[PDB]
Design a binder for these strands. Structure first.
Ligand code: 0L4
Ligand code: CL
Ligand code: CL
Ligand code: MG
Ligand code: MG
Ligand code: MG
Length: 539
DNA sequence: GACCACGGCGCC
DNA sequence: AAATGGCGCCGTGGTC
């Protein structure tokens, strides 16, 4: 392309180079734009940002987040990544998308700008005739990228002092556990090494191996294996406790306080829009979609996520979302009726599991039942089921047959979904998001059946994903108008931050928006809480 | 220092 | 571990 002076004309596509992948932490090393057979390179990248009306191009959101960081209201616009991702969600990297749709991802801003231009042209062409994918792009993905940009640049507050103090307490308990483990082994070793631990458990001590690892076929020391060996030796329980503590300390307690941004004094994640096979977002650097909540220490960590002074967190979470979605997709009357009657399948399963009345079910019991309900739905084997419930095989098997015989059209929907996936090569969500699953026609049964579970899960998980995205796009402008902030999405959950005076009003509005987003054959219900911290807000 | 595969495990 | 699905990050062991 012909080189020309900065600035570019309106509608130009941008290319840019960051010192590191995370836009909140990156230095903008270079910036360029391309349009009409010209490439414009900015002599001073930061100042040049002011000349752009929007960020249009590959990884648009990243540039937008950096702009917002610098106090510039630069929204993201067209991004070829989003087009490619809709065409085929295995399109997750600019490297792959460039190669596939007409160019090469290099380290020069001008070349990236030019690449962005031609990829958009090509990919736009590929979306012609694809009306449903076009709808998702214009009505969901493109607007959502703006929403996510604001969320990333906003961040969430963390009680750093609290976490620092907690680290010290946890360190001392870890020391007690490791000392016991070493005593019981008869000698010290690296307890963080599963290879060393395998030899201690299975070679040095008497313990029977139960399972093997996938890639290298070592004797597994996974939590599943250790639970089964709980009554074989006292060292086992000590290791399980050591694992829990060290996992939480190494992954959350210690790293996160070090990631507070110096300017904002908050913790900023990345919400990746082209990262999953089903249409879910992912979160990284750090991942804020896997903050602990199940165990006592886990809850203590989640409590570190707090509202700004004078504000409150609002947490909203769709009730039994994929089950409701399944009712709609399958059209099973029986299942639809369950939700019309305001029943809770997780609580009911839980009451069965632990053999207690529905009122006796505590949250942790209900949570346990989720794994069982979704596990069975998406193809769990009777054997594992019996195993994880520690009930005889016959009972487990019996539960799965009743599970489905209760809901006739569910199996029918699955069969229909797979048959259609085999013919077309892909399956799709309610709104037409696609996932290609070529292994539906695999001649190896284990490979084929794995593919089948991936395939019939996607429309359900993906539709739920679509619904949340649509809800975020609708909700965002309403929140802006109320002076509230959207902070995090955790798949079927949103966490907002509102001024105390308005927190109650915001919760009600957000609840109604989420419930009314796209009516199905069954009501959508959203549970909402308000609190000074994430844990409090969910209770 | 950075990458990697692996086993493992946090969440949804 | 096992015929649930979807993610990202940890330390280890290893290479470069
Ligand atoms: N906090 C949940 C911890 C255990 C779990 C879970 C799982 C959650 N999902 C998927 C299905 C669910 O609708 C969705 C939302 O997660 P969710 O909100 O935990 O589950 P839910 O909304 O059904 O129940 P609730 O009324 O409490 O919101 O994530 C799953 N899909 C496949 N296998 C699994 N084990 C799970
Ligand atoms: Cl950093
Ligand atoms: Cl839960
Ligand atoms: Mg939910
Ligand atoms: Mg949830
Ligand atoms: Mg892995």
């Amino acid at each position: 392309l012909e080189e020309a002076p900065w600035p570019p004309p309106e509608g130009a596509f941008v290319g840019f180079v960051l010192s590191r992948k995370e836009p909140m932490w990156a230095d903008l090393l270079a910036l360029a734009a391309a349009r009409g057979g010209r490439v414009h390179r900015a002599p001073e990248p930061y100042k040049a940002l002011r000349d752009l009306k929007e960020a249009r191009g590959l990884l648009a959101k990243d540039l937008s987040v950096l702009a917002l960081r610098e106090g510039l209201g630069l929204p993201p616009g067209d991004d070829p990544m989003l087009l490619a991702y809709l065409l085929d969600p295995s399109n997750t990297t600019p490297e792959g998308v460039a190669r596939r749709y007409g160019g090469e991802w290099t380290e020069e801003a001008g070349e990236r700008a030019a690449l962005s231009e031609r990829l958009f042209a090509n990919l736009w062409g590929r979306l012609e005739g694809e009306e449903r994918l076009l709808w998702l792009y214009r009505e969901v993905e493109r607007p959502l990228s703006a929403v996510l940009a604001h969320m990333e640049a906003t961040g969430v507050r963390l009680d750093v002092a609290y976490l620092r103090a907690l680290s010290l307490e946890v360190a001392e308990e870890i020391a007690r556990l490791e000392a016991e483990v070493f005593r019981l082994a008869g000698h010290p070793f690296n307890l963080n090494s599963r290879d060393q631990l395998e030899r201690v458990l299975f070679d040095e001590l008497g313990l029977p191996a139960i399972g093997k690892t996938e890639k290298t076929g070592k004797r597994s020391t996974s939590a599943a294996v250790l639970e089964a060996l709980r009554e074989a030796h006292p060292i086992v329980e000590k290791i399980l406790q050591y694992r829990e503590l060290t996992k939480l300390k190494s992954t959350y307690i210690d790293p996160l306080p070090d990631l507070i941004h110096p300017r904002t004094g908050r913790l900023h994640t990345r919400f990746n829009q082209t990262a999953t096979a089903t249409g879910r977002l992912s979160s990284s650097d750090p991942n804020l979609q896997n903050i602990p909540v199940r165990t006592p220490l886990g809850q203590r960590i989640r409590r570190a996520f707090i509202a700004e002074e004078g504000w409150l967190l609002v947490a909203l979470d769709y009730s039994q979302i994929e089950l409701r979605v399944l009712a709609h997709l399958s059209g099973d009357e029986n299942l639809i009726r369950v939700f019309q009657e305001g029943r809770d399948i997780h609580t009911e399963t839980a009451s069965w599991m632990f053999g207690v009345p529905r009122e006796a079910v505590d949250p942790l019991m209900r949570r346990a039942a989720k794994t069982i309900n979704f596990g069975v739905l998406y193809g769990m084997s009777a054997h594992r089921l019996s195993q994880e419930l520690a009930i005889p095989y016959e009972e487990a098997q019996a539960f799965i047959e009743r599970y489905f015989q209760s809901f006739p059209k569910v199996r029918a929907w699955i069969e229909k979904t797979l048959e259609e996936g085999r013919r077309r090569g892909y399956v799709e969500t309610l709104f037409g998001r696609r996932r290609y699953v070529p292994d539906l026609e695999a001649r190896v049964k284990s490979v084929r059946e794995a593919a089948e579970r991936m395939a019939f899960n996607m429309p359900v998980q993906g539709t739920a994903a679509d619904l949340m995205k649509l809800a975020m796009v609708k909700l965002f402008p309403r929140l802006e108008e109320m002076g509230a902030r959207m902070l995090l999405q955790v798949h079927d959950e949103l966490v907002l931050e509102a001024p105390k005076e308005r927190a109650e009003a915001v919760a009600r509005l957000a609840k109604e928006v989420m419930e009314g987003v796209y009516p199905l054959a069954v009501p959508l219900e959203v549970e909402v809480g308000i609190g000074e911290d994430w844990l409090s807000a969910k209770e």
